[PDB]
Amino acid sequence: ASALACSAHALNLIEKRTLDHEEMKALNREVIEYFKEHVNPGFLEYRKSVTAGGDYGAVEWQAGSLNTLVDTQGQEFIDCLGGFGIFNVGHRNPVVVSAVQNQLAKQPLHSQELLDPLRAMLAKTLAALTPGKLKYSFFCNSGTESVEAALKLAKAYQSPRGKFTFIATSGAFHGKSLGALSATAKSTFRKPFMPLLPGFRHVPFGNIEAMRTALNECKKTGDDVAAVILEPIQGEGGVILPPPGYLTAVRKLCDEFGALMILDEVQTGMGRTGKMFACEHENVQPDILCLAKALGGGVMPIGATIATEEVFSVLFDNPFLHTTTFGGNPLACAAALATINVLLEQNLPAQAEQKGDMLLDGFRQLAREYPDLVQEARGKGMLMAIEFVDNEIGYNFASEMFRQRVLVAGTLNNAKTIRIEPPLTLTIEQCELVIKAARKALAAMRVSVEEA
Amino acid sequence: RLPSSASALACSAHALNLIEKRTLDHEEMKALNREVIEYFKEHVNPGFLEYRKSVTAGGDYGAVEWQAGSLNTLVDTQGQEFIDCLGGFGIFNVGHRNPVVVSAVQNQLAKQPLHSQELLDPLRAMLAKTLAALTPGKLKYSFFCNSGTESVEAALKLAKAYQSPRGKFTFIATSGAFHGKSLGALSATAKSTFRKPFMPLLPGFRHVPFGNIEAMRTALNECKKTGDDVAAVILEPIQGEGGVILPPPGYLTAVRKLCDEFGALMILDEVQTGMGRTGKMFACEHENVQPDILCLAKALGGGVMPIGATIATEEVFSVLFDNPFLHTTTFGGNPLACAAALATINVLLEQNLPAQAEQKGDMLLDGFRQLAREYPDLVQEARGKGMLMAIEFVDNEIGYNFASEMFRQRVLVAGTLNNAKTIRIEPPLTLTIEQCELVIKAARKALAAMRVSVEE
Amino acid sequence: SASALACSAHALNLIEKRTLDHEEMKALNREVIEYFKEHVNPGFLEYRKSVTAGGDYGAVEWQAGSLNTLVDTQGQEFIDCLGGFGIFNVGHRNPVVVSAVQNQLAKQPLHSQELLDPLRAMLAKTLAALTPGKLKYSFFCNSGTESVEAALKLAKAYQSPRGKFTFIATSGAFHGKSLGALSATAKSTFRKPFMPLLPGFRHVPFGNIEAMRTALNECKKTGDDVAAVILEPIQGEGGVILPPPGYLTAVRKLCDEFGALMILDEVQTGMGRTGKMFACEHENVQPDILCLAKALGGGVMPIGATIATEEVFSVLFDNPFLHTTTFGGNPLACAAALATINVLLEQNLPAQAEQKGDMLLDGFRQLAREYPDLVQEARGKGMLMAIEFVDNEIGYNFASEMFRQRVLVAGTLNNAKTIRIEPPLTLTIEQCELVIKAARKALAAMRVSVEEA
Amino acid sequence: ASALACSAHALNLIEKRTLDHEEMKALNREVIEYFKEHVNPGFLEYRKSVTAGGDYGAVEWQAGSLNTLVDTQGQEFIDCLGGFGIFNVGHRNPVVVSAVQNQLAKQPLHSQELLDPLRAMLAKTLAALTPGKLKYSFFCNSGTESVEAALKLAKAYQSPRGKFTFIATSGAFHGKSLGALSATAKSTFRKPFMPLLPGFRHVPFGNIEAMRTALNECKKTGDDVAAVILEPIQGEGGVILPPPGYLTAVRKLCDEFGALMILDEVQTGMGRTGKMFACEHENVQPDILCLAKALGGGVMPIGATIATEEVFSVLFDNPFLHTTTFGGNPLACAAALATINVLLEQNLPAQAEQKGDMLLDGFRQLAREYPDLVQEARGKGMLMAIEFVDNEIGYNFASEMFRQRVLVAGTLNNAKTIRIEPPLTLTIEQCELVIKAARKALAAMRVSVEEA
Ligand SMILES: Cc1ncc(COP(=O)(O)O)c(CNCCCCN)c1O
Ligand SMILES: Cc1ncc(COP(=O)(O)O)c(CNCCCCN)c1O
Ligand SMILES: Cc1ncc(COP(=O)(O)O)c(C=O)c1O
Ligand SMILES: Cc1ncc(COP(=O)(O)O)c(C=O)c1O
């Protein structure tokens, strides 16, 4: 089967909007086969360990509503995965789609030679949106690129000052490209690619005592710290809330040593935590702020790295010191400008706070009833996780929830934990259903384990 | 005009309003251009305004890009229309707002633009099938991402995961090379000014002259001797940002044989040369070389979507099977980017645009080389392959003069990141024959103007 | 500006001269200063004046006086409370070591390095029997920093196939100045100009076991597992910093728990200085690898040893050329070491080190009370001691004042002005009392000096 | 036994000038035992592979004459090993022993606080002995310490100028401490200890274009080369002679790129190649010269790093930046000064030119006659090598030479090669004996490869 035939077969599929039964049965086996032969057979296996029966091979087809997804069989799922923090303003949010639609009619990608208007507008808007002295935005295409940019700003500012050491925390996830992977803390994700960047070190998350010692020792030996990088709340780490006061203490510690503070809000950002940015909870201003995922409104890929003029100015003298080819393209800018408008207009952060309190209270109730299965439920706003007693019970919860057409999934740096990350637009009724779905799942799990 | 003390909501409202405008008034344009410049100075980068001043004359620096004109042209806020010989630096291979491409994206946007990353997502599966079929020999598996630097990051990681257990950690790249600006790709990238401020980079990255098989062999052999064995060699088939440097005949074939001999992986960076630009779908098809890993981006997104693809043999890509989360990316291979790439692949094959690049590139280069002969006064030489081309001038200034002059004649050109004497000529492969003649015409006109400028 | 031959000739005649009348003395001193400036390091002249009075800066040393003194070219005798920073544990020209070196010089000073050399095998036997527990094999080299290099290389060769590559040291630590040792050495000013050093060296505060556990734990979580931990039992160049009781034992257990190797650096604390033969004997702690030098050469030869368990050292068995050095374990060096071990054990010098050390520290602690004026505190263990002063200048003055009194002391590399007191373990009881009397008059003069201003 | 006991036995053995046949047997038995149990069992296996059953046990006991050694069984060996380049003025050279004795009577080790006069004298003498602008000496204890000082000198000089990279050559042996080992090029000596110092690269020895390339590529990528380090003739590499003009072109290349040139003459130095320093064959002045081995007259361990005032001055403001504890002690200096006197008085470097040519004439003659055994013979002054067809044949030669009481040994970075590296004081008569034995060895070797 030649390339031309495949693209042709592919374009027709793209132009369909519904599938008759045989078209659907045929599409499914294609997708599985091609996943096996040309994507990654191991994904099919993972999907199996977290589902029951032929559910593993559920093929997704379209958005059903703001908060639901429909597979090729017409089956509709309430989305509690949120694409791991992407779909904050729902699937195919009308305002974001319209913005992207309109801009596509003019220009989707720019020449990168001329001044592009929306980059300017998104930079102005993010300047306005962000705390304090954060003034300048570099645009890129992803969370990991966003962090690459932050690291490079820190390096360019700090290396002429003789500081080269970066401190991150264990449990941290910061991206998978090799620069970001150097801060990313999970052993498994790191070792096969060593050596990574030199001069990266890790302290326990949420522990200012340990961090203070890290910086002190680095100073004594002339390996002075250039920057500290952390998530305000560790995402892939299993939704780990630092003790109240931590972020502020990290901020003070960085001030004292003249280290930069990098906040990775790729997952906590754009309202997910009940505020626009998680750092607004303790009102901490980083020197550099990393955004992505939800910044594209569920429609476009985009990352943004926002820093003070003091830091960002290292890119002024030679503007080509850091670039990327698609970064801040018009479609992506359109999407993010829409998203920002939607979040503020509909006060989605406050909604995240209220829906989050509600779900977590529900999950904490269920935790009380099933301590044979559940360890604890935790979270802030619409970033939640349920930790289970062990991995297999976790994988069974995800499976039982999928069976009830509610999408959930695990976290990258914590195997016992299932995240709950719905769109901030999840309705009150859907919230209750998600609780009811979790209850049935736990009851079923009791039976399955009890007999076994 | 929109206040300094403006709420985020207000800014977003203002911006959403502008997005909805199909056409700009004169006084609307005057206001928008003022905002954009101001916000560039204050929120993007004041330096990029300074740069634009150095490749334009007078007020041209403030040119604000506004929309596609036709397939091969762009229109600024003033309504001025430009023939595009820049091509988003290798992006716009099938023109601006290519109908088939825009169509696919639009169609996919109606279903689901971004995926959950949990369920099996069909356009990923399909673009992987398509690419496996579009690529030489044993290239079978694809990883999808959002840019060329991500494509290269994935390539280096694949090599690393494959070679690490075999005890090999060293990477060989070439001077002049450009592979990205993320810190991993940047280790392979070769320009001193893009690298130094960010050192230390990845350890164990070394460089040899591009085109020099003996130099490479010496690198690999010496690394073998010292127990610093080479994991992979990474190179472009033709150095783009280096200034369109073509290697000697058989070099790629030779690099392949050299990699086979040493047990190194061969990575080909076709982020710029790929998707038909140099006269074939992939530049490695000119010598018929099969790399172990092939990097794609830029033009793969049809000039509508951002996308990167990293494609490898099953033998190499299998390092990702036991643990499919070993390497991931949030947005990678999302439905929009896939639809865009599938459409682009279809367009390219259908209209035989790789063959068009050969012919239109042959025509253009030939005319450029002719201008080179007539104006040795200003021009060092003209080189290229398919629609990837360069004019090298005798100065640095002359090249900026030429850029400035061509802009004045509403033809878009720009310089290369690793060569300050070179102006690239990188038009859509859909550039009409008429538009070619105009380009040479403008090139001649500019060279003439530049000649009399000296004689002031 | 003579010829090389002419220069060497002059030097040989000087080497033959055992006495210098007033004529030769001034010519010599003038030469030595001039050549230091032009061919050695003009900066040592600056430092020396920095810690001397008037024309004390130009004190050219000439020969040993007695066990515990040095005489300069002007016939000025100094009591040695410097000890070559831990070298002269058995005094200057100790007859038993001097003799053993002459006897060996008469036979063979250096060896072929191809035939089995007896004194290397004998010394290894002797150190096996002198060292704690499973410490069995010895690698011989020429200096403290060389012995640390061998120790890093052993740990590396052992832990590399086991997948561990990170090394933990302590701040305040000093392990040598060759670039491998320098990676574990902790003083910023000694390290910075020579970076990048070896990757994967990290530092925890000395004496803080919870801090060390966190570092090992975190390195583990991220897949940068610690191969080894290196430390001095007592930090020397750091300023005689004593760990809390049980800390060394806790480091041993922590290492045991993480499967990291323990490297104990006793280059300075070893050969009796702290009251035992090895400082690790106070708590009965067995390192996997133990480093020795300085005093191991009896004050006559340069030598270092790196001693390890058969477990660790066996990495060198299959390829005995994997780690070597050219002069390492030569007959002269071994002869000196064997004589030194004999003198220490026979004359019970570590027990003496305890007694004299206590006597001296008492003395300094009393002076500390009488002069909070000038003295922060005095601390020590055995004959490894330090007086810490208020100012770094107050202290330069103490050193400079003691020098006028023909008592020799000097600073410590890591800290700003702490004076180490590291006299031969053979300091007489009477000499001890003179050192305390001198310290007193020095502080007295310094106080008067602070007024009168 | 206790440690006191052992030390006592050892001090009795040291005082013994000669051995009873039973004392000899007991000493030999105990030496092999302690080598096995306390030194390295492998070195005993190594000796076996280069001796004929039983000879491996030989325990060396004393210098015989100036050019011979005597084992415990009174067996006397002509020394063509030279302690791998140590014994240039013979064993127990009377002028060197005398010097060391006399200084030992006064003060063997310095205080490191008072100015020690022989340090001054040796640094003066070295400054006189060295080419051109070489002026300042740092004294240490070995070749590898000498290379360490050289690397640090280059580092302290070049790091403030933005240059951190080092170029060495394949085949190179520069020492085994971890800084020097970073330059030392033999795979087998390097891998188990990696990661070494970052930024060390290797080009092939004697290839000038490959070095221009490496220097220029490093300039291009911003990894500018701080120093180039090389032996004038690779020693452990198998006596590898660069083409005429190579060394000088390397010096000019360094000038061109502003890299410091470090010449490692730890083995080639002090007369061995026919000149006092091998760099004198082409009148090259490095920025930093490294010396050791024979610098201590075959009596003391000593190393020296000599540099231009321009380079060495990096240690002037803080003379404590780089030290070693025993470096430059009166004994080592006395030995070094005596050795310089002997070599100059007796015209020994020149003797090495004549004797080397004469010995290489014999070996070249033998290579003609035994092409079944010998690939080629080569040398510069008294630094010679015989390359055989196999590693095997080489081992056999070393063994046959050992039976004949002529001591030779292989080279660390070359398996087919046997070094011939005698004192420069080797007599003409002994030169003829060495050639006779080599001839005999080859004969036995031949007739015994034929009974196979
Ligand atoms: C604990 C410790 N470890 C290593 C060294 C270095 O010894 P060296 O023989 O290579 O110099 C030392 C040495 N310290 C004092 C510096 C002497 C020069 N003033 C040590 O204490
Ligand atoms: C050229 C060269 N450079 C350094 C060294 C190492 O000096 P060392 O005094 O630390 O050993 C050498 C020495 N190699 C021969 C020793 C082999 C084992 N007997 C050298 O040739
Ligand atoms: C905290 C954090 N940082 C960075 C990233 C990298 O994002 P991407 O996968 O888009 O590169 C992620 C993705 O999950 C994340 O959760
Ligand atoms: C060959 C090559 N590789 C990689 C890149 C970088 O990819 P991106 O700019 O999309 O991150 C470029 C960009 O010009 C390129 O030409």
Coordinates of N, CA, C and O and ligand atoms in Angstrom, one line a residue, chain C residues 112-114 142 146 321 324-328, chain D residues 43 81 83-86 141-147 172-177 180 184 230-236 264-268 290 292-293 302-303 410 412 419 421, ligand 2:
Chain C
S112 N 63.4 -1.8 39.9 CA 63.1 -2.0 38.5 C 61.6 -1.8 38.2 O 61.3 -1.4 37.1
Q113 N 60.8 -2.2 39.2 CA 59.3 -2.3 39.0 C 58.9 -3.5 38.2 O 57.7 -3.7 37.9
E114 N 59.9 -4.4 37.9 CA 59.6 -5.6 37.2 C 59.8 -6.9 38.1 O 58.9 -7.7 38.1
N142 N 53.0 8.1 46.2 CA 54.0 9.0 46.7 C 53.5 10.2 47.5 O 54.3 11.0 48.0
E146 N 47.9 11.4 45.8 CA 48.0 10.2 45.1 C 47.2 9.1 45.8 O 46.6 8.3 45.1
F321 N 48.0 -3.9 35.9 CA 48.5 -2.7 35.4 C 47.4 -1.6 35.2 O 47.6 -0.5 34.8
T324 N 48.7 2.0 38.4 CA 50.1 2.0 38.8 C 50.6 3.4 39.0 O 49.9 4.3 38.6
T325 N 51.7 3.5 39.6 CA 52.5 4.8 39.6 C 54.0 4.3 39.6 O 54.3 3.2 40.0
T326 N 54.9 5.2 39.1 CA 56.2 4.7 38.8 C 57.1 4.5 40.0 O 57.9 3.5 40.1
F327 N 57.1 5.5 41.0 CA 58.0 5.4 42.1 C 57.3 4.7 43.3 O 58.0 4.4 44.3
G328 N 56.0 4.4 43.2 CA 55.2 3.9 44.3 C 55.7 2.7 44.9 O 55.9 1.6 44.2
Chain D
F43 N 50.0 -9.6 39.7 CA 51.3 -9.2 39.2 C 52.2 -10.5 39.2 O 53.1 -10.6 38.4
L81 N 65.9 -2.5 31.0 CA 64.6 -2.0 31.3 C 64.6 -0.6 31.8 O 63.8 0.3 31.4
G83 N 64.1 0.6 34.7 CA 63.1 1.1 35.5 C 62.1 1.9 34.7 O 61.5 2.9 35.2
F84 N 61.9 1.5 33.5 CA 61.0 2.1 32.5 C 61.4 3.6 32.3 O 60.5 4.4 32.0
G85 N 62.7 3.9 32.4 CA 63.2 5.2 32.0 C 63.6 6.0 33.2 O 63.8 7.3 33.1
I86 N 63.8 5.3 34.3 CA 64.2 6.0 35.6 C 65.7 6.0 35.8 O 66.3 7.1 36.2
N141 N 56.0 14.8 43.0 CA 56.6 13.5 43.3 C 56.6 12.4 42.2 O 57.1 11.3 42.4
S142 N 56.0 12.7 41.1 CA 55.9 11.7 40.0 C 55.5 12.3 38.7 O 55.1 13.5 38.6
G143 N 55.5 11.5 37.7 CA 55.1 11.9 36.4 C 53.7 12.4 36.3 O 53.4 13.4 35.8
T144 N 52.8 11.6 36.9 CA 51.4 11.9 36.9 C 51.1 13.2 37.7 O 50.3 14.0 37.2
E145 N 51.8 13.4 38.8 CA 51.6 14.7 39.5 C 52.1 15.8 38.7 O 51.5 16.9 38.7
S146 N 53.2 15.6 37.9 CA 53.7 16.6 37.0 C 52.7 17.0 35.9 O 52.5 18.2 35.6
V147 N 52.0 16.0 35.3 CA 51.0 16.2 34.4 C 49.8 16.9 35.0 O 49.2 17.9 34.3
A172 N 48.8 7.8 23.6 CA 49.5 8.6 24.6 C 49.4 8.0 26.0 O 48.4 7.5 26.4
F173 N 50.6 8.0 26.8 CA 50.5 7.8 28.2 C 51.0 9.0 29.0 O 52.2 9.4 28.9
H174 N 50.1 9.5 29.8 CA 50.4 10.7 30.6 C 50.3 10.5 32.1 O 50.4 11.5 32.8
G175 N 50.0 9.3 32.5 CA 49.8 9.1 33.9 C 48.4 8.5 34.3 O 47.5 8.5 33.4
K176 N 48.2 8.1 35.5 CA 47.0 7.4 35.9 C 46.2 8.0 37.0 O 45.1 7.5 37.4
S177 N 46.6 9.1 37.6 CA 45.7 9.9 38.4 C 44.7 10.4 37.5 O 44.9 10.6 36.3
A180 N 45.4 13.3 34.8 CA 46.3 12.9 33.8 C 45.7 11.8 33.0 O 45.9 11.7 31.8
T184 N 45.8 10.5 29.1 CA 46.2 9.2 28.7 C 45.1 8.5 27.9 O 44.0 8.6 28.1
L230 N 51.3 16.4 24.7 CA 51.8 15.3 23.9 C 53.3 15.0 24.4 O 54.0 15.8 24.9
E231 N 53.7 13.7 24.3 CA 55.1 13.3 24.4 C 55.7 13.6 23.1 O 55.1 13.6 22.0
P232 N 57.0 14.0 23.1 CA 57.7 14.2 21.8 C 57.9 12.9 21.1 O 57.8 12.9 19.8
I233 N 58.1 11.8 21.8 CA 58.1 10.5 21.3 C 57.2 9.6 22.2 O 57.5 9.5 23.4
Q234 N 56.2 9.0 21.7 CA 55.3 8.2 22.6 C 56.1 7.0 23.2 O 56.6 6.2 22.4
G235 N 56.1 6.9 24.5 CA 56.9 5.8 25.2 C 56.1 4.6 25.3 O 56.4 3.6 24.7
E236 N 55.1 4.6 26.1 CA 54.3 3.4 26.4 C 53.5 3.0 25.1 O 53.1 1.8 25.0
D264 N 55.0 16.5 27.4 CA 55.2 15.5 28.5 C 56.6 14.8 28.2 O 56.7 14.0 27.3
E265 N 57.6 15.1 29.0 CA 58.9 14.5 28.8 C 59.3 13.7 30.0 O 60.5 13.6 30.4
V266 N 58.2 13.2 30.7 CA 58.4 12.4 31.9 C 59.3 11.1 31.6 O 60.1 10.7 32.3
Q267 N 59.1 10.6 30.4 CA 59.9 9.4 30.0 C 61.1 9.9 29.0 O 62.2 9.3 29.2
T268 N 60.9 10.8 28.1 CA 61.9 11.1 27.1 C 63.0 12.0 27.7 O 64.1 12.1 27.2
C290 N 56.9 18.9 31.3 CA 56.7 18.0 32.4 C 57.9 17.0 32.5 O 58.3 16.4 31.5
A292 N 60.0 14.0 35.2 CA 60.0 13.1 36.3 C 61.0 11.9 36.0 O 62.0 12.1 35.5
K293 N 60.6 10.7 36.4 CA 61.4 9.5 36.3 C 62.9 9.7 36.6 O 63.3 9.8 37.8
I302 N 60.6 12.1 42.1 CA 60.5 13.5 42.0 C 59.8 13.8 40.6 O 59.9 13.0 39.7
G303 N 59.0 14.9 40.6 CA 58.5 15.4 39.3 C 58.7 16.9 39.3 O 58.9 17.5 40.3
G410 N 57.7 -5.2 28.5 CA 56.8 -4.7 27.4 C 56.4 -3.3 27.6 O 56.9 -2.6 28.5
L412 N 53.1 -0.4 27.9 CA 51.7 -0.4 28.4 C 50.7 -0.2 27.3 O 49.6 -0.8 27.4
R419 N 60.3 -3.0 25.1 CA 61.1 -1.8 25.2 C 62.6 -2.2 25.5 O 62.8 -3.2 26.2
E421 N 65.6 0.0 27.0 CA 65.7 1.3 27.6 C 66.7 1.3 28.8 O 66.3 1.5 29.9
Ligands
LIG2 C1 55.2 10.1 29.4 C2 54.8 9.7 30.8 N1 54.0 10.5 31.6 C3 53.6 10.2 32.8 C4 53.9 8.9 33.4 C5 53.4 8.6 34.8 O1 54.4 9.0 35.8 P1 54.4 8.3 37.2 O2 55.7 8.7 37.9 O3 53.1 8.8 37.9 O4 54.3 6.8 36.8 C6 54.7 7.9 32.6 C7 55.1 6.6 33.2 N2 54.9 5.0 32.8 C8 55.6 3.7 33.0 C9 55.2 3.1 34.3 C10 54.6 1.7 34.0 C11 54.5 0.9 35.3 N3 55.8 0.4 35.7 C12 55.2 8.3 31.3 O5 55.9 7.4 30.5

